[PDB]
Amino acid sequence: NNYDGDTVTFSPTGRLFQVEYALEAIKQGSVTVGLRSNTHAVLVALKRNADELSSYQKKIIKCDEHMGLSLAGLAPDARVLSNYLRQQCNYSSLVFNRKLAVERAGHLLCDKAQKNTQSYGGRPYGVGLLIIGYDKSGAHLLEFQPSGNVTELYGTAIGARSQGAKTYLERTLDTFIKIDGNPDELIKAGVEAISQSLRDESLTVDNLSIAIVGKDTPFTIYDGEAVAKYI
């Protein structure tokens, strides 16, 4: 109310409203899902268009050969943050000849978002990210919020109506965690998960976006006729 003019102001109950308003931009964004087994990690994203004459806004971005994310909210902010991750993954390779741990990737994103919440003039990032990767400790899935909070999960979903997929994955936990050495089945589980967040619209060929990374699979994105297999 009187305490939402900027990020540098606390409310009387200890809330940061500008951070909460940034969180709201994620809720308006199109749904995206993340889940993993012990061998692979999978992103599934519903893309959004302006109208029937327009393209469908791309949701998934590659960060390295072993890492990448999906976005929900302000896309330019995702471009800034993904670019930062690309650099950090790259610094780790050039300097230490070491693939950046997915956990450190999370810690770095947390600290970059935080600085924008404690200083005058700046603003919080207006996007949520789901980071998947495969490193020296196996498959991983992370959830980034622009408050700074990063969380490691077996599965999750962010965006509009993400609660449907999040409940489904919570039920399916014991099943999909043991889909080891089978990519097409782990994707099927993710495509079934995102279907629990659909209303009036269904998954078409230029609407669905899938990404996968794993033990013997580089981070690769599938669009167009390559996702027809899963509809």
């Binding site: 939402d4 900027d6 940034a22 809720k27 308006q28 327009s54 896309a75 330019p76 003039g121 603003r123």
Partner: protein
């Protein structure tokens, strides 16, 4: 007052949303993409009859393979065009090739959110970026001050946009010829324009793989206007 980079309670940036209103006040610009080329047309809209209309420059070349049309606070576009031209030429210097239309558009859109307390406010102008490259062929992009860009088969921006866009929804198909697209831009511009459309208050342009980006003469557009009127009377 309040911060320039402040979020609204609905999760939108006030200044970006307000700049979108400035663009709705701008003159109409239309783009249509075909397999034979992309057409770009604009309403000039002279504020007075004494103003020499051919000095109104709302369609602009970025490179030989990329053109651009604008709508809104058109003075804001100058530095965007300057950046686009430099980006296009610089890439050709670094890589001995033409830069992709999408990569150009992304470079322009990177400027958009570089405001706050960097420039003092967002841009008050929307751009239609049309071009060709070997990988993805003929392309049309709509670049906004939000930093977002969508690819379009056809798109209208400005005061007559929502009415023109609904018209483009019906008329566009994947087999349109270049000549068919030219007439379609003229037709839809004549519908949404205030004053009566002629060769002096409207301007056409296109980009083809063979001849590159070309702004049409007033004589050439005049004949397309005459060809359009005759065809509508013929049924």
């Amino acid at each position: 007052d309040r911060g320039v980079s402040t979020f609204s309670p609905e999760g939108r940036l006030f200044q970006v949303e307000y700049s979108l209103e400035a663009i709705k006040l701008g003159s109409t610009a239309i783009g249509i993409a075909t397999k034979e080329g992309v057409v770009l047309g604009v309403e000039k809209r002279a504020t007075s009859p004494l103003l020499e209309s051919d000095s109104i420059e709302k369609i602009v070349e970025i490179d030989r393979h990329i053109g651009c049309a604008m709508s809104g606070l058109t003075a804001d576009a100058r530095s965007m065009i300057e950046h686009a031209r430099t980006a296009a030429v610089t890439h050709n210097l670094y890589y001995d090739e033409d830069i992709n239309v999408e990569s150009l558009t992304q470079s322009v859109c990177d400027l958009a959110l570089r405001f706050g307390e960097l420039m003092s406010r967002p841009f008050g102008v929307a751009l239609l970026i049309a071009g060709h490259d070997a990988d993805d062929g003929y392309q049309l992009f709509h670049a906004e001050p939000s930093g977002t860009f969508y690819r379009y088969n056809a798109k209208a921006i400005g005061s007559g946009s929502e009415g023109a866009q609904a018209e483009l929804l019906n008329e566009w198909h994947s087999s349109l010829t270049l000549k068919e697209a030219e007439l379609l831009v003229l037709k839809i511009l004549k519908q949404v324009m205030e004053e009566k459309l002629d060769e002096n208050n409207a301007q056409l342009s296109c980009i083809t793989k063979q001849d590159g980006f070309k702004i049409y003469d007033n004589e050439k557009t005049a004949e397309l206007i005459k060809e359009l009127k005759e065809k509508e009377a013929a049924e």
